[PDB]
A paper describes a structure:
Circular tandem repeat proteins (‘cTRPs’) are de novo designed protein scaffolds (in this and prior studies, based on antiparallel two-helix bundles) that contain repeated protein sequences and structural motifs and form closed circular structures. While these cTRP constructs have many favorable properties, we have previously noted that their ability to self-assemble from smaller subunits is compromised by relatively limited contacts and small surface areas that are involved in packing between repeats and subunits. Based on those results, we hypothesized that a new generation of computationally designed cTRP proteins with increased repeat size (corresponding to longer secondary structural elements that increase both particle thickness and the number of buried contacts between repeats and protein subunits) would improve both the energetics and the stoichiometric control of self-association. In this study, we describe the de novo design of thick cTRPs (‘tcTRPs’) with repeats composed of longer helical bundles that form a new underlying repeat topology and demonstrate their solution and assembly behaviors, their structural features via X-ray crystallography and CryoEM, and their ability to be functionalized with additional folded protein domains.
To validate the accuracy of the tcTRP9 particle (harboring nine repeats), the recombinant protein was overexpressed and purified, its apparent molecular mass analyzed by size exclusion chromatography, its thermal stability verified by circular dichroism (CD) spectroscopy and its crystal structure determined. The protein eluted from an SEC column in a single relatively uniform peak at a retention volume corresponding to the mass of the protein (56 kDa) (left). CD spectra collected at 22° and 95° were nearly superimposable and indicated the presence and retention of the helical secondary structure after heating (right). The crystal structure of the tcTRP9 particle, determined to 2.1 Å resolution, validated the accuracy of the design. Superposition of the design model and the experimental crystal structure produced an rmsd value for all alpha-carbons of ~0.5 Å, and close agreement between side-chain rotamers within the inter- and intrahelical repeats and interaction surfaces. The only positions where the side-chain rotameric conformation significantly differs between the design and the structure is for a pair of leucine residues (L11 and L37), which interact with one another through van der Waals interactions between their side chains in both models. Repeats from tcTRP9 and tcTRP24 are shown with darker shades and lighter shades, respectively. a Alignment of the sequences of an individual repeats from each of the two designs. Both designs are based on a 57-residue sequence that forms an anti-parallel two-helix bundle.
Author numbering: 1 to 513
């Protein structure tokens, strides 16, 4: 009776259904769409059963993980339904999302009574996630009543998160305060998305106040944590500053406010400058994991700046974003190299992941600029990561370290995704086919590892392998997308149905246990 392991399997089931739904749409295959809906519905049916058992036993953490699957299932059912006019599916999706929101609010109440503020914020994140799914459904159906309910759910989450941040400060617990600020940012993003259903100016202004409230406090918390020498805390705060700036840019973009656009960009640049200084300090002290966390903020800040620059081809911001991403790529390469010399292969893989993420941001900038050399530089970064990933995977499997191997295969899938996107940017069939083969190799090794894991009875390991299958199948679907590649869509559908079927078997065994 391993409920945590069963839920992990069901999340894989939802993720596979989501991928099959995307493949079914690209190919107009109504039968495949029906199959994806049943998988998503079956995942939600079992998750809702597990939610009930978890709460009966008082395991609120497990119950929240079950509610998240309800929400993800609802999202998948709404994505399937909106193309056609499938009101019966949208109603099921709304029912699931509303049930998740209700239970989330009940658990937030109970968590706060018992003084468990971290649990309460996890309940509020589910509340925000359910509000997001409801907002999409309500926008599809032109149901203003339900849009109003989604907005009220997001606002309730932000209101409670504001209260918990104040309690957290009073207990000196700034880490917890930051988790509350992240709820504010996520709630603000949902409200702005709801307000973008034509001129709800009062909702947009509410969303902007929330995001600005989080930015202001994240910036001050980062400054103080850094002055007190608490670098790990400062970076968490800088991530929230970047996330707040992203939402402010979306609000600014929508409301045509060039002033707010510029403010959002300054916040993102300030976060990147602080992260750059923290990375240099962390490497001076020899703290490579810290340093890599700083570099990912550089990439995230650069991604925000490039998005801000999108519409109007802003020359300063695009070149600023380019230098930030290249800075992170170079330092990640250096750290990967040192980590591999010191035999620290997990650290090396984290560095390659930052390299892939930097390369993705550079490819976006190169694309918008028609910059051939930067596109080529981005592809070389992605190809460097993929090559090092398969070397680490090969050695990991040789020594029987399957978890390490799977982490390396995930890097390979991510690098293939970046290379696929560059291949789109050049209209190059050859590069596109090379990216697909990188993804196919990763999927092939992941299937064999899943088989070896299950033969040994290691179901936790096998589920991690199945997730790579899902992610690989998603990359293959993105490559065949808008190209009419029937051969590739079939390989993608095959991988996602493989993961789905094995996830179902593992869920069943975990529930017996």
């Amino acid at each position: 009776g391993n409920l945590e392991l069963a839920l992990k399997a069901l999340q894989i089931l939802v993720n596979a259904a989501y991928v099959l739904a995307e493949i079914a749409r690209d190919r107009g295959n109504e039968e495949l769409l029906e199959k994806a809906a049943r998988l998503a519905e079956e995942a939600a049916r079992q998750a809702e059963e597990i939610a009930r058992q978890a709460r009966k036993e008082g395991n609120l953490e497990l119950a929240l993980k079950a509610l998240q699957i309800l929400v993800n299932a609802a999202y998948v059912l709404a994505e399937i339904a909106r193309d056609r006019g499938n009101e019966e599916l949208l109603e099921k999706a709304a029912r699931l999302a509303e049930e998740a929101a209700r239970q989330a609010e009940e658990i937030a109440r109970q968590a706060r009574k018992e003084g468990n503020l971290e649990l309460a914020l996890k309940a509020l994140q589910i509340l925000v996630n359910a509000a997001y799914v409801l907002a999409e459904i309500a926008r599809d159906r032109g149901n203003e009543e339900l849009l109003e309910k989604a907005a009220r759910l997001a606002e309730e989450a932000a209101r409670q998160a504001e209260e918990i941040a104040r309690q957290a400060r009073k207990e000196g617990n700034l880490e917890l305060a930051l988790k509350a600020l992240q709820i504010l940012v996520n709630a603000a993003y949902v409200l702005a998305e709801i307000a973008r259903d034509r001129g709800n100016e009062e909702l947009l202004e509410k969303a902007a106040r929330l995001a600005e409230e989080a930015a202001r406090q994240a910036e001050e918390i980062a400054r103080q944590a850094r002055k007190e020498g608490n670098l790990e805390l400062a970076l968490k705060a800088l991530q929230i500053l970047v996330n707040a700036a992203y939402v402010l840019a979306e609000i600014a973009r929508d409301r045509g406010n060039e002033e707010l656009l510029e403010k959002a960009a300054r916040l993102a640049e300030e976060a990147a400058r602080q992260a750059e200084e923290i990375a240099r300090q962390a490497r001076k002290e020899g703290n490579l994991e810290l340093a890599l966390k700083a570099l990912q903020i550089l990439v995230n800040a650069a991604y925000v700046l490039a998005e801000i620059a999108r519409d109007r081809g802003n020359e300063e911001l695009l070149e600023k974003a380019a230098r930030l991403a290249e800075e992170a790529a170079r330092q990640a390469e250096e750290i990967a190299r040192q980590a591999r010399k010191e035999g620290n292969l997990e650290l090396a893989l984290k560095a390659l992941q930052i390299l892939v993420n930097a390369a993705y941001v550079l490819a976006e900038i190169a694309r918008d600029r028609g910059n051939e050399e930067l596109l080529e530089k981005a592809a070389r970064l992605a190809e460097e990561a993929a090559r090092q990933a398969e070397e680490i995977a090969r050695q990991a499997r040789k020594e029987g370290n399957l978890e390490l191997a799977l982490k390396a295969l995930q890097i390979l899938v991510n690098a293939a995704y970046v290379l696929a996107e560059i291949a789109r940017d050049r209209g190059n069939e050859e590069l596109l086919e090379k990216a697909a083969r990188l993804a196919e190799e990763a999927a092939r090794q992941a299937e064999e590892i899943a088989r070896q894991a299950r033969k040994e009875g290691n179901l936790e390991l096998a589920l991690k392998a199945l997730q790579i299958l899902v992610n690989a199948a998603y990359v293959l679907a993105e490559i065949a997308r808008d190209r009419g590649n029937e051969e590739l869509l079939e390989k993608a559908a095959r991988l996602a149905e493989e993961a789905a079927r094995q996830a179902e078997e593992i869920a069943r065994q975990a529930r017996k246990e």
